[PDB]
């Protein structure tokens, strides 16, 4: 294994036992539960405004604009009806969602607008308080948030509740001031692990552009689980590790095919869960230094009871 990817999994796991871990969950971890993607939703708007589906496969990203045109010409009721047809479904919970929660995250932030990571933490018993619009930031029950930064459909399957159009990314800071201010504070006070984005996502480069406005050594550097099937080129890794990320590349660890997405998320997260169990300690000075980190504060005590040591070694 690498020389720095051993250092990442140490530094994630020294933050999970401290309770300073926040998993920013992206779109791809909801795709492994076979939720409909948005290109399937932008084609259907293109299949109504123009009558025919698109053959020119949306080069240079004009599909930031197709639902804006569908909203502005036709009705907002017509926009909200097609959102009902696709998203009022019920899909399972992939085994990655059991692995996000097993690292005991203090918060979870997500750009998803499904209720999938909602319904996965109920069923596990760790209660998270959902924050999906601006009114819920003040009414937050617990000390443990589930911050859907692009909204949710719990109040209703209507386009005003979820950031989808072009105009909801333009007018976003104005419209959602307290969520963005809460996301930025969760990052500054936690260790962030991105999962299920790409490197050119909007919600990743609207953050590395924010982090550039900070000092030289204020923030911790967020990890990134890159699960694209090609390996990273070593020049892309040079840039994005000098921007603030610390990428963990799934292809450079294990070899799998060009469509086994589920294997590569379960590759990296099971290399994270299992490092807590910790079948990775080998050397003789790695045995001394586990025990010295857990007994050395007890030299200022005089005599520890032999049964309070069961609480020491977990």
């Amino acid at each position: 294994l690498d020389n720095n990817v051993v250092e990442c999994i140490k530094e994630i796991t020294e933050s999970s036992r401290n309770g300073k871990l926040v998993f920013f969950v992206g779109a791809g971890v909801s795709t492994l539960s076979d939720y409909p993607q948005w290109w399937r939703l932008v084609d259907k708007y293109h299949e109504e405004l123009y009558g025919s589906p698109k053959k020119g496969n949306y080069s240079s990203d004009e599909y930031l604009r197709i639902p804006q045109i569908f909203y502005n010409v036709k009705g907002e009721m017509a926009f909200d009806g097609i959102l009902k047809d696709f998203f009022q479904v019920d899909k399972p919970t992939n085994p990655i969602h059991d692995k996000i929660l097993a690292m005991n995250p203090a918060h979870v932030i997500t750009t998803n607008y499904d209720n999938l990571i909602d319904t996965a933490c109920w069923k596990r018993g760790k209660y998270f308080s959902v924050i999906s619009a601006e009114e819920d930031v003040a009414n937050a029950t617990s000390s443990r948030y589930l911050l859907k930064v692009a909204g949710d459909f719990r109040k209703g399957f209507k386009g005003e509740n979820v950031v989808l159009k072009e105009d909801d990314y333009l007018n976003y800071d104005q419209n959602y001031p307290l969520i963005s201010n809460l996301m930025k504070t969760i990052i500054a006070t936690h260790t962030i692990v991105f999962i299920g984005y790409g490197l050119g996502d909007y919600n990743i480069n609207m953050l590395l552009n924010w982090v550039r406005k900070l000092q030289k050594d204020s923030f911790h550097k967020p990890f990134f689980i890159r699960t694209d099937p090609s390996p990273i080129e070593n020049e892309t890794l040079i840039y994005y590790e000098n921007k603030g990320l610390r990428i963990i590349d799934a292809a450079s660890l294990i070899d799998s095919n060009e469509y086994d997405y589920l294997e590569r998320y379960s590759a990296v997260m099971d290399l994270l869960i299992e490092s807590q169990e910790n079948k990775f300690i080998t050397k003789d000075d790695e045995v001394i230094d586990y025990i010295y980190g857990k007994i050395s504060p007890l030299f200022a005590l005089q005599y520890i009871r032999k049964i309070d040591l069961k609480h020491v070694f977990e």
Partner: peptide, 12 residues
């Protein structure tokens, strides 16, 4: 990893 001790604390 259903911590039974972390059930009252997780509730609001």
């Amino acid at each position: 990893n259903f911590n039974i001790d972390d059930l009252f604390n997780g509730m609001p």
